[PDB]
Amino acid sequence: EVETFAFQAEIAQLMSLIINTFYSNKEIFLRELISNSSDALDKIRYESLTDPSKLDSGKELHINLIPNKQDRTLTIVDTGIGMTKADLINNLGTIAKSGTKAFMEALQAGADISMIGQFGVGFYSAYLVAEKVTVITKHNDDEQYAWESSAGGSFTVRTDTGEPMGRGTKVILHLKEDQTEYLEERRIKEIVKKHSQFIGYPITLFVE
């Protein structure tokens, strides 16, 4: 049963801003997604100190970057804390309202889109390069969910029946036709080295 939801208006306008503004420095999306993965890994690691069972769903803490030219996808996989249904449907959006407002204010004052992460809404920079984003996620005491949006003001959430994950998040970037440079090993390596070089977890770049 696929449920369809309307974004809060502020979030829909955030996504419209990212899709519509002329801004050539699109590669920062990867730093923002890798940074979110790293934070999610930090979180499960720390919580596991006071509740070691929380690693029963997988001890390994890492990030994979998986390009697939057949599907025109780039997937950022982590074994972090994952997200709950309540996260996906309501709670992330409620928080990102304030971040969106602060971000838009900073931009009018002369900030640029590369600073989006300072406002807690860097995930949406995925829409610099992706026409559609699918987020597969599994949090410990909850089911595996698939969230999906091509913007346009709505998103869907369904229980995922594809490959079970254990714990963590996959962000599947369905890249725009003119953004397939982010499927090339040389380009991804350049970007990781430039903007994600001190991440404290292994980042494996799959080959094709």
Curated annotation (Swiss-Prot):
Q: What is its main location?
A: nucleus
- Stretch list, region Interaction with NR3C1: 1-208
Please report the PTM annotation for this entry. Answer: ISGylated. S-nitrosylated; negatively regulates the ATPase activity and the activation of eNOS by HSP90AA1.
Spell out which residues are annotated as carrying N6-acetyllysine. K43, K69
Where along this sequence does the record place binding of ATP? N36, D78, K97, F123
Q: Which keywords does the record carry?
A: Acetylation, ATP-binding, Cell membrane, Chaperone, Cytoplasm, Host-virus interaction, Hydrolase, Membrane, Mitochondrion, Nucleotide-binding, Nucleus, Phosphoprotein, S-nitrosylation, Stress response, Ubl conjugation
Q: Which domain of life is it from?
A: Eukaryota
Write one Gene Ontology MF term: transmembrane transporter binding
**Gene Ontology cellular-component annotations:** apical plasma membrane; axonal growth cone; basolateral plasma membrane; brush border membrane; cell surface; cytoplasm; cytosol; dendritic growth cone
Q: Which terms does the UniProt entry file under GO BP?
A: activation of innate immune response; cardiac muscle cell apoptotic process; cellular response to heat; cellular response to virus; chaperone-mediated autophagy; chaperone-mediated protein complex assembly; mitochondrial transport; neurofibrillary tangle assembly
Subcellular localization(s) per the UniProt record: Nucleus; Cytoplasm; Melanosome; Cell membrane
Effect recorded for G82D: Abolishes ATPase activity
Q: State the oligomer form and interacting partners.
A: Homodimer. Identified in NR3C1/GCR steroid receptor-chaperone complexes formed at least by NR3C1, HSP90AA1 and a variety of proteins containing TPR repeats such as FKBP4, FKBP5, PPID, PPP5C or STIP1. Forms a complex containing HSP90AA1, TSC1 and TSC2; TSC1 is required to recruit TCS2 to the complex. The closed form interacts (via the middle domain and TPR repeat-binding motif) with co-chaperone TSC1 (via C-terminus). Interacts with TOM34. Interacts with TERT; the interaction, together with PTGES3, is required for correct assembly and stabilization of the TERT holoenzyme complex.
What is the purpose of this protein?
Answer: Molecular chaperone that promotes the maturation, structural maintenance and proper regulation of specific target proteins involved for instance in cell cycle control and signal transduction. Undergoes a functional cycle that is linked to its ATPase activity which is essential for its chaperone activity. This cycle probably induces conformational changes in the client proteins, thereby causing their activation. Interacts dynamically with various co-chaperones that modulate its substrate recognition, ATPase cycle and chaperone function.
- Family designation: Belongs to the heat shock protein 90 family.
**Any domain commentary?**
The TPR repeat-binding motif mediates interaction with TPR repeat-containing proteins like the co-chaperone STUB1.
- The name this protein goes by in its record: Heat shock protein HSP 90-alpha
Organism whose genome encodes this protein: Homo sapiens
Provide the organism lineage as a comma list. Answer: Eukaryota, Metazoa, Chordata, Craniata, Vertebrata
